[PDB]
């Protein structure tokens, strides 16, 4: 019963993280999205910032002329609403971890300086790639809920 | 350089376009045969923008004509200026959209789009350097709304870095012409907001006002209404096509006119708007023109400007004038209408002075206003639409073409979003 | 010989240029044909023809196309006239980051070639506008490149500054500030003229009721002719470009002298006048005659220079200066007693056929620094703060290779500048 709550502590220690990461979903302006839709030759910082969320959904293309198409489409807004990294694959997340743990753009200072158009969404992308971490927090102990529970 | 690819979709689009071409043709000295017979070298200095030359001084608008029916575009051909088009540029099917957005976008027009896009692609590659795409397309029809909007989407995907401007003719709540005008407009707008850089919203009501009061034509022909909008578009694009003391690119206008990504809708005007023989009383001056332009009677939009404040203004004058006069004149104007200029933006107005008059008026002007007031136009349509959606009315025509209630709800959301933003920046 | 380079950038630059090269030709005695020591501004060709030592750049080909068809056409070798594809459209981020980082390299080439010609390359003159799209980013970019190349060379900046009242363009305020961020740390000296003040001068002193851009430009150009003629001509006390920099930059950061070119006198005002040396001095110091919208009495002239031309004799000048020093109204800075340099040149200004001015035997361009220009800075900072509170037109710039943080830093710089001037005044 002591270990029965320690395996239930994991959902509680990720509770501040999950809530704040899903608070980065709610802190989204409709105007800020379309600034990206109206941007043709962006800063290299904001370009990488959308490459962060490009492969989160699963688009390997990196050209700005070609990546603006996913941004341009109207599928892009509702998918950001309901999004969970719990269902996001580990392998792709690993690619999201490897690439984005090297980013100057991941530093909340570079994005903010570049634009406030990319500001809260990188604040989401840090929270959302850290939602991948919440997945990697809960899941290496979920096995304890499958055999030890 | 900086050439524009015209488009005309739906009877309305097709007809304004018809008259539009005729108008630009006269301005650049081109006759009905596609031959040049003009005395102004400046016409052929920058003919490029609006025409391709071929063998034997052949001239040809870079214009694509689209109609889901053949009829309206076959009338085009019969017309005097109709034979200036290279007939390969009329792309039509033979199933009418019949004032159904779903027929235009999803079904009948999805079949005819690919062919049209091929014609689009011809034109882009034939450009020294493509600037923009002008689409004259009604909002409230079938071939303007659905087919028009579908055309815009695909074109934006193909050339995202370029200008998309649409002189979109909108419903007038006081003179509705079609049943589901609300449906067509709402579905169109939801797409348009996201797919264009600038849209000049012209309703028939305002045109009538102009004709009746000022031009004193108490028998408006669609011809006359069209002649009006035509001149508007010519004025917009005069700078690209003629040398100037200060020259406003289409992009320049967009950049100067638009506070935010979204609120790109405009109200064009024109001056001098006078009847024949009502000009001898007048005398053409910069003040005169400005006064005419800033008057409500010379607005080609639904909204009364004074029911709101202009966010920005861009007055693209024509003919030979003193920059100083214009500057000094529009400074007075900023001051007088303190109530109807938004605070956010000092130097609200943006003057551009083309050095070319419109072949028969010693001076002229063209207004472009961005007013918070235009929220009212959207309100009217939102209201009209909403009530009918309450009874799920006419639904069967659209559900039949694959469209869904949730879509409509989302279109309503779009409308609501547009009106709230204007309220915020009131 | 001491020899120079011209760089006209942006519509304004080139338009100013059109005026400038007319003047020089009329002075040195060159026809538009190029047929006839002018070494400074004309480089002699193989035989007979003389070629202007100039660079003519614009992204808007419209402007320089007018150049290529004007009577001033065959004067310039078309090595000079560079063209770009599309205009900067009042975006600093298109002038600098996009269309700039494309055509800049070609321009750097032409510059280098011209530099090779010059035996004794004195320096540069950069006609641009703080508040056009071209001249706001592109100018800064060009300046940067030249600094990297030469460094030690003289660089001068005839900057059409925003008139606090008069309106051209909505984003105008943003552009200036970005330019300032970058310009002030390259150009060792920057003579800034706004159009409104020039218009004032046009209306009052010349009695002209229609101030065209042409006329406004001829005046600006006559400011530059006087600055040069010390190089271009013989005479006692001859000044050099380096001399100004050394004279009129009390602290290495602050270098924004105002300019006034008296007499500004019409065909009438020639009679009812005698045009004495000391008359013209007083006129120059007049609060109304400043070529900026700045009142010089709202601070202290830090250090002043006066470039008399034609039949000017030194002592007369010296007595007028005594008088000027005497007047306690016209405040000077405590810490430098004698704040003048006088250059007297035997060449008088020669006036353009079909123009504002009549043959004034004596003339003087006073290039005076003042702490009083801090008023025009503040105004502009305010205009920018107001629009950047709403973050308006943000989207245009950002999406063109810019930083939001760049906007913030620019203001910081302005604050620092203002603070420095305050210190100096104290
Ligand atoms: C001597 C004189 O003043 O003649 C004018 C005239 O009397 C008035 C009434 C003209 C006249 O305009 C109209 O009749 C009209 C009717 C409905 C909608 C718009 C115009 C004119 O017909 C129209 C005509 O316009 C032109 O010639 C322009 O080039 C115009 N294009 C055409 O009219 C045109 C007609 C057929 C085929 C091709 C072009 C234009 C305007 C702006 C931009 C591009 C082109 C002009 C100057 C006049 C008349 C003949 C009376 C006015 O319009 C124009 C465009 O000039 C009406 O408002 C002005 C005020 C003018 O005073
Ligand atoms: N003196 C003078 N100033 C001008 C002239 N034309 C424009 N200006 C000024 O220049 C600014 C307006 O922008 P422009 O200089 O025309 O723009 P640009 O540098 O050509 O940039 P783009 O139009 O984007 O290519 C304002 O300060 C105008 O007052 C002109 O002929 N003479
Ligand atoms: N200004 C103008 N409007 C027109 C013209 N013809 C039709 N319209 C408007 O177009 C609207 C109907 O759309 P329409 O494009 O005809 O439908 P479609 O034929 O199915 O494309 C109506 O509100 C008419 O007022 C015209 O020649 N000029
Ligand atoms: Mg220009």
Residue numbers in the entry:
A (entry chain C): 3270 to 3418
B (entry chain B): 1 to 426
C (entry chain A): 1 to 36, 48 to 437
Question: What does the published report state?
Answer:
The dynein family is a group of minus-end directed microtubule motors. All dynein family members share a common architecture, based around a heavy chain that contains a cargo-binding tail region and a force-generating motor domain. Dyneins bind to microtubules via a small microtubule-binding domain (MTBD) consisting of six short helices (H1-H6). Nucleotide-dependent conformational changes are transmitted to the MTBD through the stalk to modulate its affinity for microtubules, allowing dynein to bind and release as it steps along the microtubule.
To fix the stalk in the high microtubule affinity α registry, we used a chimeric fusion construct (SRS-DYNC1H13260-3427) in which the mouse cytoplasmic dynein-1 MTBD and 12 heptads of stalk are fused to a seryl-tRNA synthetase. We determined the structure of mouse cytoplasmic dynein-1 MTBD on microtubules to an overall resolution of 4.1 Å. Regions of the MTBD close to the microtubule were of sufficient resolution to see the pitch of alpha helices. We built and refined a new model of the high-affinity form of the MTBD using the low-affinity MTBD crystal structure as a starting point. The Cα RMSD between the two structures for helices H2 to H6 is 1.9 Å. The major movement involves H1 and CC1, which move together to occupy the intra-dimer cleft above α- and β-tubulin. A more minor change is seen in H6 in order to accommodate its interaction with α-tubulin. The only significant conformational change that occurs upon binding is the movement of H1 upwards to accommodate the change in stalk registry. The MTBD interface made up of H2, H3, H4 and H6 shows only minor changes upon microtubule binding, suggesting it is in a binding-primed conformation regardless of nucleotide state. This interface can initiate contact with the microtubule, but a stable microtubule-bound state cannot be achieved when dynein is in a low-affinity state due to a steric clash between H1 and β-tubulin. When the motor switches to a high microtubule affinity nucleotide state, H1 moves up and the MTBD can be further stabilised on the microtubule by interactions between H1 and β-tubulin.
